[PDB]
C-alpha cells in the first residue's frame, strides 16, 4: 500500500552520462554505442544564444573542439553532425554500459523520469509529465542542459527528452533524441511564452483510481455523467477533453476497482465544482495529473 | 529554476539488490562486500508472523536454506547470523559493485531515497522522510521487504532504512541496517498504532525558502515572530517545535534570500492561520515537509 511519485531506477542512464565542452560552454551528453548526443547550443556563448545561426557557428568547429569526458577519462571525437537541435559526436569507443535503448517522441500527458546532471554527473532523479503546452516543470539549474528524460520497459530504456531551455516563466523546453523540440520552442534566448497549461484529465482519473486502491475513498459520490457533460465541466476548469480512447485506457483500473469510468468522471466533476474542502487525496490537496494509467497499474502491480 | 521532489540517483544501490528466499518466503536483500542483509522475517510463514520466536525459528535454518540470487546467478551462503531484526548472510563472493557505504541511523524529519524492489529487482525510486512518529509513508507492495533507504554524499552511500512492515493504517515501519526498528515497532503481525504524525516544521521553512528562491513569493508577509510565539501556533497545528538548532540550520537559506528565519516563521504562522486560499506554492496546495534544509541547498546548488 501507499502511492508515491516514483521515478524509474536511474542506473542504466547514469551509465550513459558524459560531459561535453565546446570552448567555454559545458553541458551534459548522452553516450549510446559510439555516439554522444548533446544540445547543439554547446557551440554557443550566452551572446550567441540571442540570435544563433547554428550552421554558421558549426563551420568554425572541428572534432577536436568537442571535449567529451566520461568519468575522468577523455573520449576521442572522430566525427560530428547536427540533427535538428542536437549534435551527434561520433567517438572511437562504444559506451560499454550502453543499455538496450530506443528513441521515442512522447505525446502530451505522458510521464517520464529525468536524471538531472551537471558536468556529466547525476545529481538527482524525478518524475515529470509532458504538459499539454509541451513544456515540462522540471528542476534544472545552469549546467543541466543535455540531462535526459526516459521510460524503462524491463531492460530497455526509451529516451524521450533532452533538456535545452528554461522559458522566462521558469518552465522547461527540450527535444526528443532526434533533436526536434516538443512544442513550438526554439533554442534561442528570445520571448517564448507557453500556452495554457491544462490539466491531464485521464491522468487525474488514473490517480483517483490509485487513491481508491490505496483506501482513500471519501470523494466517491452517488453520481454518474456522460463524456459530453463531463467535457463541458472539464473545459470550464482548463482540463483536457476526455475521449473514448482515454475511457478505454482506464478500463483495467475500472475493472480492478469496480468503478465505471464515467462514475469516476462524476466524482472528479464534483471535486472540480466543490473543491477539496481542506481534505487530501493520497497526501495531496490538489488533483495530481503526473501519473498515467500505465504508471498507476505499474506501481499498483510492482513491475520491475 | 524549478524545485522537484528529487531522489538520489539509484545506480549504486541497484548494484546491491539481491533476492533472498527461505522456504516459501521471498524478499529483497542488500549485498555489500560478502554479506547479504535482509529482514529476519524471511524465515517466517504468514502464520509465523502472528507470534514469531525468531531465535527458535532460526534453529531450524542452515546456510543452504537461504537462497540468494544476484541477477540470475546463485550466491553460496557460508554463514548466517541474526543482528536485532536483520539477518546477515555471509556469502563466498564480495559484491563487485559494492559502493563506498556507511550505515547511519537517521533522526525523525530526515529525508532519504527508497529503491522499491521486488524479487531483488528495482521497480522505482522515490524520496521519503522519517516521520516524527518513526513511520514512513512509502509505496511498498507484497515482496518489497528488504528494499532500502539511503542518502548519497558524492561517492558514499549512507544506508539508513530497510523495509519490514506495513501497519494496518497502511504506513510503513522498518529498521536501520543494524536491524533496530525506527520507533516502537516490532516485526510481528499484531496491533501496532502510530502516534501523531506531526509536520516537520524546519522542513516546511526550508521549502518556503526554496519557493522564494524559485520566485513563488506571494505568501511573504510584513510580520515577524519569536520562537516562543511561533511554537504556540506550531503546537496548535501539530507542527514540531522549532529550536534554535533548527534556526541555525536554516542560516544559509536566510543569508541567500535575505529573509530572517523568524520572518519566514511569521509567514508560516499566517499560512497556518489563514490557509492557502486556493493558491499553490511550488505546485503544492499544502505545506511540504519532506525537504530538509540540506535538500533545499543541494537542489538549489546542483550538488552531484
Ligand atoms: C546548459 C547546461 C548550458 N551550460 C551552461 O550554461 C553552464 C556554463 C558553462 N560554463 O558552460 N555549464 C555548466 C557546467 O555550469
Ligand atoms: C516481504 C517482501 C515479504 N514477502 C512476501 O510476502 C512475498 C510472498 C513470498 N512468496 O515470499 N514475496 C514476494 C516476492 O512477493
UniProtKB/Swiss-Prot annotation, chains A, B:
It catalyses: TSAVLQ-|-SGFRK-NH2 and SGVTFQ-|-GKFKK the two peptides corresponding to the two self-cleavage sites of the SARS 3C-like proteinase are the two most reactive peptide substrates. The enzyme exhibits a strong preference for substrates containing Gln at P1 position and Leu at P2 position. It is found in: Host cytoplasm; Host Golgi apparatus; Host nucleus. Changing residue 49 to A: Does not affect ability to cleave and inactivate human TRMT1. Residues 1-304 form the Peptidase C30 domain. It comes from Severe acute respiratory syndrome coronavirus 2. Residues 1-304 are cytoplasmic. It comes from the Viruses. Inhibited by pyridone-containing alpha-ketoamides compounds 13a and 13b. In turn, alpha-ketoamide 13b (tert-butyl (1-((S)-1-(((S)-4-(benzylamino)-3,4-dioxo-1-((S)-2-oxopyrrolidin-3-yl)butan-2-yl)amino)-3-cyclopropyl-1-oxopropan-2-yl)-2-oxo-1,2-dihydropyridin-3-yl)carbamate) inhibits SARS-CoV-2 replication in human lung cells. Inhibited ex vivo by michael acceptor inhibitor N3. Inhibited ex vivo by compound 11a and 11b. Cleaves the C-terminus of replicase polyprotein at 11 sites. Recognizes substrates containing the core sequence [ILMVF]-Q-|-[SGACN]. Cleaves and inactivates human TRMT1, preventing tRNA guanine(26)-dimethylation of tRNAs. May cleave human NLRP1 in lung epithelial cells, thereby activating the NLRP1 inflammasome pathway. May cleave human GSDMD, triggering alternative GSDME-mediated epithelial cell death upon activation of the NLRP1 inflammasome, which may enhance the release interleukins 1B, 6, 16 and 18. Also able to bind an ADP-ribose-1''-phosphate (ADRP). There is a cross-link at residues 5, 90 (Glycyl lysine isopeptide (Lys-Gly) (interchain with G-Cter in ubiquitin)). This is 3C-like proteinase nsp5. The lineage of its organism: Viruses, Riboviria, Orthornavirae, Pisuviricota, Pisoniviricetes. 3CL-PRO exists as monomer and homodimer. Only the homodimer shows catalytic activity. Interacts with host FBXO22; this interaction promotes the proteasomal degradation of nsp5. The chain holds residues 3264 to 3567 of 7096 of the full protein. The active site is at residues 41, 145. Changing residue 90 to R: In strain: Beta/B.1.351.
Amino acid at each position: 500500500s501507499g502511492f508515491r511519485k516514483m521515478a524509474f531506477p536511474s542506473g542504466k542512464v547514469e551509465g550513459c552520462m558524459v560531459q561535453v565542452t565546446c570552448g567555454t560552454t559545458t553541458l551534459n551528453g548522452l553516450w549510446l554505442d559510439d555516439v554522444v548526443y548533446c544540445p547543439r547550443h554547446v557551440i554557443c556563448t550566452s551572446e550567441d544564444m540571442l540570435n544563433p545561426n547554428y550552421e554558421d557557428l558549426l563551420i568554425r568547429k572541428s572534432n577536436h573542439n568537442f571535449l567529451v569526458q566520461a568519468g575522468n577519462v577523455q573520449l576521442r571525437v572522430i566525427g560530428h553532425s547536427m540533427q535538428n537541435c542536437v549534435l551527434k559526436l561520433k567517438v572511437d569507443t562504444a559506451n560499454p554500459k550502453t543499455p538496450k535503448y530506443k528513441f521515442v517522441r512522447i505525446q502530451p500527458g505522458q510521464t517520464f523520469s529525468v536524471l538531472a546532471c551537471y558536468n556529466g554527473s547525476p545529481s538527482g532523479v524525478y518524475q515529470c509529465a509532458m504538459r499539454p503546452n509541451f513544456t515540462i516543470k522540471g528542476s534544472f539549474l545552469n549546467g543541466s542542459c543535455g540531462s535526459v528524460g526516459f521510460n524503462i520497459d524491463y531492460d530497455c530504456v526509451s529516451f524521450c527528452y533532452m533538456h535545452h531551455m528554461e522559458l522566462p516563466t521558469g518552465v522547461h523546453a527540450g527535444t526528443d533524441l532526434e533533436g526536434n523540440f516538443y512544442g513550438p520552442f526554439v533554442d534561442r534566448q528570445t520571448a517564448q511564452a507557453a500556452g495554457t497549461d491544462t490539466t491531464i484529465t485521464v491522468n487525474v482519473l488514473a490517480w483517483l483510481y490509485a487513491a481508491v486502491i490505496n483506501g482513500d475513498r471519501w470523494f466517491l459520490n452517488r453520481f454518474t455523467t456522460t463524456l459530453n457533460d463531463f467535457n463541458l465541466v472539464a473545459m470550464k476548469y482548463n482540463y483536457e477533453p476526455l475521449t473514448q480512447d482515454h475511457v478505454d485506457i482506464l478500463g483495467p483500473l475500472s475493472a480492478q476497482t469496480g468503478i465505471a469510468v464515467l462514475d469516476m468522471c462524476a466524482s472528479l466533476k464534483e471535486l472540480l465544482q466543490n473543491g477539496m474542502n481542506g481534505r487530501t487525496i493520497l497526501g495531496s490537496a490538489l488533483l495530481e495529473d503526473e501519473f498515467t494509467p500505465f504508471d498507476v497499474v505499474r506501481q499498483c502491480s510492482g513491475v520491475t
